[PDB]
Amino acid sequence: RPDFCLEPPYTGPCKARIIRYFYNAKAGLCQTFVYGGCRAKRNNFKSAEDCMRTCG
Amino acid sequence: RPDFCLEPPYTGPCKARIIRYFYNAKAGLCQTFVYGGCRAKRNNFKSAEDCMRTCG
Amino acid sequence: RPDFCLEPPYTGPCKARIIRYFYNAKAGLCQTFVYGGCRAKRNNFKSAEDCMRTCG
Amino acid sequence: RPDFCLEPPYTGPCKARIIRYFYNAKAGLCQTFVYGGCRAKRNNFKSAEDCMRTCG
Amino acid sequence: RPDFCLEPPYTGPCKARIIRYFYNAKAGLCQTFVYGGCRAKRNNFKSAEDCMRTCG
Amino acid sequence: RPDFCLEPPYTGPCKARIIRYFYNAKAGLCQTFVYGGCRAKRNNFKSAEDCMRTCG
Amino acid sequence: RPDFCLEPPYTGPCKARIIRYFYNAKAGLCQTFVYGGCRAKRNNFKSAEDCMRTCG
Amino acid sequence: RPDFCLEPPYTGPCKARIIRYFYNAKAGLCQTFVYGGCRAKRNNFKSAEDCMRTCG
Amino acid sequence: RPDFCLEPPYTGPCKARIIRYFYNAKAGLCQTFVYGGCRAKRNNFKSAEDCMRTCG
Amino acid sequence: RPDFCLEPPYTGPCKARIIRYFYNAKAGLCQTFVYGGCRAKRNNFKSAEDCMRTCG
C-alpha cells in the first residue's frame, strides 16, 4: 500500500462538485468525497474499483 | 432483508446533489434521493439494481 | 398507452437538476425536463428509449 | 444537410447546466453549448457523433 | 506533440462545471480543470486517454 | 405595455452573476434576477427606473 | 417606522453575492448583508441612505 | 465602421466575470459578453454608448 | 485619530469578496482588503476618501 | 514617468477578482488585469484615466 493512500481527501480550490473516492486508512476502505475539479492529490480516484485495488 | 434497509435516506453535510437510491420500506421499493457526496449511510445505492436485490 | 403518460412533468421539491424524459401527449413524443431528485411521478424516465417504448 | 443545422444554439428557460452539441455552420463543425434542460430546438445533440453525421 | 498542448486550460464564459483534461507541459501529464461548457480551446479533452495519447 | 414584459426572466448560458431587473406581470412590478452575462432577452433591464417606465 | 423594518435579513435562493443593507432593530441602525439576487423581502435596500430614512 | 467591429467576442484566459459589450455584426447592435479581465481584443467596450457610436 | 483605526482588518464570516479600505497604522495610510459582506468592524470604509479623513 | 510604471502587474494573495489597470511599458498604454484585493503594488490603478496620466 502506497504512502499517498494515508493522505486526507483534498477538495481543492475549484467550484465543481464531483464525487471521487479516497482511501480512509482508519476505516479500512474507500469512501466518497467532493472534489472541486482541479489540483487533485494522489488519494483521489474516479473509480471505486481502482481505489480498493491500489490502496487495498 | 438487512436491518439498514429500514433506515431513512441520509443526504449528509456535503454540497453535491447526486441522485442515489434508497429502500423505502413503507412503499416496498427503491426510490431516489439527493446525496450530498460524503458520509453516506448504508441505505444508499449508486445502482437501482443493487438496491432492489439487496433490500428486495 | 398507460394513463400516467398523460400526466404533466413533475420536478418535485428537491434541489438537484437532472435531465429526465416525459411523454408529451400533445406533441406525440418524449421530451426533456428538469427533475429535482426526489418524489418522482410515473411520467419520468431516465432513458429516452424506455419513455418512447412505454408511452409510444 | 437539414436546414435546422443552421439554427443558433438555444439554451432554453430551464435551470440545468448540461453540455450538448450544436452544428456551427460558420466553423464547419459541431461545438459544445450549455442546454438548460427543457424546450430544446432541433440543433441540439446529446451525442457528438450524431451531430456530425446529421449536419456533416 | 502538437503546439496546442502547451496552451493553458481555458474555462470559457459559460456557467457549467464540467471536468475536462488538459496537458500540463510543466508537470508532464494530463490534469483536470473545470470547463464552462462553450468556446473550448484545443487543450481540452473529454477523455483522459485521448489527452495522454495526443500530447504524450 | 409591450408583449415582452410578460416573458419570464432569462439567465442565459454564461457564468457571471449580475443583478438585472425584470417585470413580473403577476406581482405588478419589477424584481431582481441573476443574469449570466450573455444572450439576454428583452425582459432584462440594467436600470430599475427603465424597467418600471417601459413595463409600467 | 414600517412593520417590515423588523424582519430579519433574507438572502434568498440565488447564487449572487451582492451587498445590501437591512435595518437591525436591536442595533438601531442599518447594516450590511449578502443578498442572493432574487426573491427579496422589504428589508433590503440597495442604498444605505434609503435604509436609514425609511426605517429611521 | 472599423474592421475590428467584425471580430467575435474574446473572453480571455483570466478568471473575472465582467460584463462588456461587443458589436454583433449579424444582429446589427451591441450585445453583452463575459470578459475574463485580461488580454482584451478591440471589440470590447466598457460602455454601451461607446460601442454603438464606434461600430454604429 | 479614533482608537478603532488601529484595529486589524476584519473580513467576517460571509461569502462576498468586496474591496473595502482600512487604516494601516504601521504604514500610515489606508489600504485595501477583502470584506466578506457582513458583521463589519469599524476599521472598514467603502470610500478611500472617508478612510483617510477619519484616520488621517 | 515614475519607475514603478515599469513593474509587472501584481494580483496578490487575495481571493477577489477586481479589474484594475496597469501600465504596459512594452505596449505603451494601460491595460487591464485581475487584482486579488490586497497588498497592491504601485502599478495598480482603479481609474484608467489616472493610469495613462501618471505613466503617460
UniProtKB/Swiss-Prot annotation, chains A, B, C, D, E, F, G, H, I, J:
Keyword Calcium: no
GO CC aspect terms: extracellular space; serine protease inhibitor complex
Top-level taxon in the UniProt lineage: Eukaryota
Compartments, as annotated in UniProt: Secreted
Gene Ontology MF annotations: calcium ion binding; molecular function inhibitor activity; potassium channel inhibitor activity; protease binding; serine-type endopeptidase inhibitor activity; sulfate binding; zymogen binding
4Fe-4S recorded as keyword: no
Marked site (Reactive bond for trypsin) residue numbers: K15, A16
GO biological process, any: negative regulation of serine-type endopeptidase activity
Keywords tagged on the record: Disulfide bond, Pharmaceutical, Protease inhibitor, Secreted, Serine protease inhibitor, Signal
Disulfide pairings: C5-C55, C14-C38, C30-C51
Major localization class: secreted
Function: Inhibits trypsin, kallikrein, chymotrypsin, and plasmin.
Name of protein: Pancreatic trypsin inhibitor
Source species: Bos taurus (Bovine)
Portion of the full-length sequence here: 36 to 91 of 100
